[PDB]
Amino acid sequence: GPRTCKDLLDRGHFLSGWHTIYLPDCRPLTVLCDMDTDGGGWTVFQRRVDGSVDFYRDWATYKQGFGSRLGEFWLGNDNIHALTAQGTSELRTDLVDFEDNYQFAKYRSFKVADEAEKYNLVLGAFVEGSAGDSLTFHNNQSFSTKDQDNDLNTGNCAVMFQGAWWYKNCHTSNLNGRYLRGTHGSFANGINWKSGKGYNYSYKVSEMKVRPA
Amino acid sequence: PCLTGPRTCKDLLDRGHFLSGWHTIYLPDCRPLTVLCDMDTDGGGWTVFQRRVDGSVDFYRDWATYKQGFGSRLGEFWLGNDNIHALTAQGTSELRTDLVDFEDNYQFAKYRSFKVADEAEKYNLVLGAFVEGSAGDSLTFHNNQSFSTKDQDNDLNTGNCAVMFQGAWWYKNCHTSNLNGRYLRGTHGSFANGINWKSGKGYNYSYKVSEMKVRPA
Amino acid sequence: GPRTCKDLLDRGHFLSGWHTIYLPDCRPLTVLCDMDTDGGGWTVFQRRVDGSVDFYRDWATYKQGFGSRLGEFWLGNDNIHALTAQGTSELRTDLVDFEDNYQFAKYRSFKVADEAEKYNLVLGAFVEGSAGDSLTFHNNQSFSTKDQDNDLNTGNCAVMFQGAWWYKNCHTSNLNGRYLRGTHGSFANGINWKSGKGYNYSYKVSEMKVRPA
Numbered sequence: 001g002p003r004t005c006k007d008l009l010d011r012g013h014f015l016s017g018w019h020t021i022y023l024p025d026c027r028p029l030t031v032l033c034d035m036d037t038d039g040g041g042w043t044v045f046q047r048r049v050d051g052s053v054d055f056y057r058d059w060a061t062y063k064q065g066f067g068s069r070l071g072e073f074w075l076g077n078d079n080i081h082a083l084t085a086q087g088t089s090e091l092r093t094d095l096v097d098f099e100d101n102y103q104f105a106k107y108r109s110f111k112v113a114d115e116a117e118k119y120n121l122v123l124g125a126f127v128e129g130s131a132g133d134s135l136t137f138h139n140n141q142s143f144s145t146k147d148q149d150n151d152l153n154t155g156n157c158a159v160m161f162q163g164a165w166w167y168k169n170c171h172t173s174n175l176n177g178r179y180l181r182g183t184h185g186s187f188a189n190g191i192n193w194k195s196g197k198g199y200n201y202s203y204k205v206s207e208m209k210v211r212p213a
Numbered sequence: 214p215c216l217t218g219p220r221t222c223k224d225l226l227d228r229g230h231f232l233s234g235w236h237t238i239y240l241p242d243c244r245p246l247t248v249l250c251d252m253d254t255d256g257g258g259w260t261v262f263q264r265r266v267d268g269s270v271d272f273y274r275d276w277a278t279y280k281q282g283f284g285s286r287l288g289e290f291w292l293g294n295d296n297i298h299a300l301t302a303q304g305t306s307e308l309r310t311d312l313v314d315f316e317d318n319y320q321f322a323k324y325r326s327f328k329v330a331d332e333a334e335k336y337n338l339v340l341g342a343f344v345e346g347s348a349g350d351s352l353t354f355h356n357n358q359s360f361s362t363k364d365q366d367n368d369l370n371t372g373n374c375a376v377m378f379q380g381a382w383w384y385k386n387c388h389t390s391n392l393n394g395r396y397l398r399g400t401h402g403s404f405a406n407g408i409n410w411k412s413g414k415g416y417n418y419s420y421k422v423s424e425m426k427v428r429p430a
Numbered sequence: 431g432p433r434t435c436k437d438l439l440d441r442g443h444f445l446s447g448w449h450t451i452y453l454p455d456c457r458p459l460t461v462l463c464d465m466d467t468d469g470g471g472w473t474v475f476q477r478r479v480d481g482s483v484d485f486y487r488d489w490a491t492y493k494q495g496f497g498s499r500l501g502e503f504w505l506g507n508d509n510i511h512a513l514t515a516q517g518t519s520e521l522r523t524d525l526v527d528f529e530d531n532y533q534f535a536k537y538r539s540f541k542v543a544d545e546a547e548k549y550n551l552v553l554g555a556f557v558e559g560s561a562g563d564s565l566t567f568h569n570n571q572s573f574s575t576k577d578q579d580n581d582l583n584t585g586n587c588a589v590m591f592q593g594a595w596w597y598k599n600c601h602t603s604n605l606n607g608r609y610l611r612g613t614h615g616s617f618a619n620g621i622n623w624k625s626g627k628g629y630n631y632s633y634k635v636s637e638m639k640v641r642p643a
């Protein structure tokens with residue numbers, strides 16, 4: 001049975017949507033496949049679209065995943081690790097601002113370690129993207145929530161920028177931040193990408209997606 | 214197969230489905246129904262039977278349409294009175310109503326029990342006690358009243374509440390909530406004909422999002 | 431075995447949405463059923479809603495289908511042919527403008543031939559709707575894309591009006607054109623329907639759908 005969204009694209013599924021794939025050890029899982037972007041075959045593990053879901057959540061919630069198939073979600077750190085663990089695949093970040101303006105940014109490999117390793121971000125080459133690089137900064141850094149401080153700052157970046165990310169001191173990207181809708185006076189606590197629209201602009205749409213090498 | 218399966222969205226949550234979305238359950242009588250499960254709110258496991266989000270669907274509809282259900286899995290819908298009765302007839306389901314205004318304020322109401330009688334009793338609302346909620350109690354008023362639509366006036370008003378207030382609801386004489394009213398988008402001059410909740414944002418403010426959902430005790 | 435969205439309606443599915451049906455050839459297809467409009471039971475094969483999907487696409491892409499179950503899509507010419515081949519189905523076209531005024535056109539029968547015949551369009555007589563008739567003009571003409579010009583123009587109409595359609599010389603409807611959002615100065619390159627809002631108005635919503643005659 002189908003193991004990646006790439007497989008499903010290969011089996012003639014051309015419309016984006018939720019399909020079940022089979023995890024290394026046989027667990028059925030409905031993932032969102034993006035069959036459209038950049039050749040198609042992407043498995044989406046994060047999406048922000050309308051601010052209907054609260055992303056300011058604790059460790060246990062990020063671990064198992066949350067949100068809605070109808071709109072916004074986070075697939076879950078366990079699932080994300082399961083998907084990008086054995087073998088390797090690439091990350092694609094997509095961003096649309098409120099004027100209908102598209103930008104992206106691909107890297108050539110992406111993986112997160114398991115819970116014992118605090119979901120460490122393993123990130124390689126920024127290939128290209130109109131949105132620029134604002135994610136390598138966070139390379140080799142442990143995942144943080146508001147109730148598990150594993151960050152580089154002396155104070156809690158997750159709580160400060162209202163999100164859950166691979167926080168150092170602190171961040172150039174904050175895609176799990178608050179849905180602030182465009183420009184905001186508050187500093188760096190929205191759906192922000194430094195090299196893209198900056199620390200005071202919150203995107204309308206964000207998607208993080210992977211595809212096998 | 215209609216044994217094996219999940220009977221409520223609560224069952225599906227317990228079976229490790231963590232993302233909200235459309236799943237098929239089996240009603241007390243094995244009939245399989247595809248429902249929207251809210252796995253996120255207040256512990257998760259809610260079956261959503263009403264959803265207003267963007268005004269794309271007309272809720273000003275006749276009796277037959279409310280009976281079988283209408284709208285879209287992609288956006289707004291009413292599950293259908295038959296289904297709603299089937300879902301709530303045996304047992305106690307708590308009810309929760311979730312509301313969001315256009316300035317991003319979120320409000321809710323919660324009730325100990327909720328059930329609607331069958332068609333012969335005109336989908337009579339049987340409402341348990343108000344338990345808590347920022348939105349305030351604007352449903353207790355409608356306890357023990359028949360459902361009404363534009364073409365079937367079962368209210369306690371000499372007029373037709375469903376025509377005056379452009380919805381369908383368990384109107385009394387006439388209302389304190391009108392969640393199936395017109396999608397008027399925020400404050401409106403017209404009186405009480407929007408997606409209104411009296412103790413919430415009053416008779417002149419129509420919310421951006423409303424959801425009604427149920428879950429086993 | 432449900433063969434059409436009409437079948438699903440008769441079996442008591444009253445909410446519009448994506449359901450899987452079985453084609454005359456037995457392939458299972460997941461389609462958008464419109465259970466609401468004009469008695470319900472329509473299978474939607476084209477949907478424009480917000481301009482999120484690029485419809486300016488090549489032959490291979492139109493053949494297999496593209497877009498998203500969450501928003502805009504084209505079911506795919508192969509699928510459309512498979513759904514229209516045997517018997518005959520009605521066609522309804524629904525159009526919404528930016529003040530939410532709805533229009534429609536309705537045709538007794540509609541079918542597209544297969545790839546060998548270039549998905550040639552076989553349309554029956556105009557029945558009533560208020561949008562007027564802007565498809566009859568296109569009867570008996572192959573489908574053209576930017577990369578497969580089958581029109582009756584010395585140029586490439588798909589390139590001239592940036593869509594893909596049964597172009598003659600050139601068109602009176604262009605529902606796969608650019609999502610230009612209301613009135614546009616450019617000529618006839620939007621989601622246009624001549625007898626509806628003319629060559630300089632691009633609709634907000636467009637849907638093409640079929641149902642057993």
Ligand SMILES: *[C@@H]1O[C@H](CO[C@@H]2O[C@@H](C)[C@@H](O)[C@@H](O)[C@@H]2O)[C@@H](O[C@@H]2O[C@H](CO)[C@@H](O[C@@H]3O[C@H](CO[C@H]4O[C@H](CO)[C@@H](O)[C@H](O)[C@@H]4O)[C@@H](O)[C@H](O)[C@@H]3O)[C@H](O)[C@H]2NC(C)=O)[C@H](O)[C@H]1NC(C)=O
Nearest residue numbers: 330334335337338339356357358359360367368369384385
């Ligand atoms: C729910 O509300 C009803 C009244 O509302 C109607 O019924 C409900 C189900 C909805 O369909 C509404 O839309 C309808 O409008 C209450 O019913 C009344 O209850 C009171 C007692 O609490 C009854 O009053 C008693 O009547 C006795 C005589 O009863 C018989 O005769 C009357 C006519 O007078 C007749 O209506 C009734 O059915 C009997 O046939 C009298 O001896 C006693 O002392 C007292 O006055 C009243 O009769 C009921 N009205 C009706 C129409 O039945 C429900 O009790 C209420 N339920 C709950 C759970 O609160």
Ligand SMILES: [Ca+2]
Nearest residue numbers: 153154155156
């Ligand atoms: Ca710290």
Ligand SMILES: [Ca+2]
Nearest residue numbers: 366370371372
């Ligand atoms: Ca009356």
Ligand SMILES: [Ca+2]
Nearest residue numbers: 579583584585
């Ligand atoms: Ca030509």
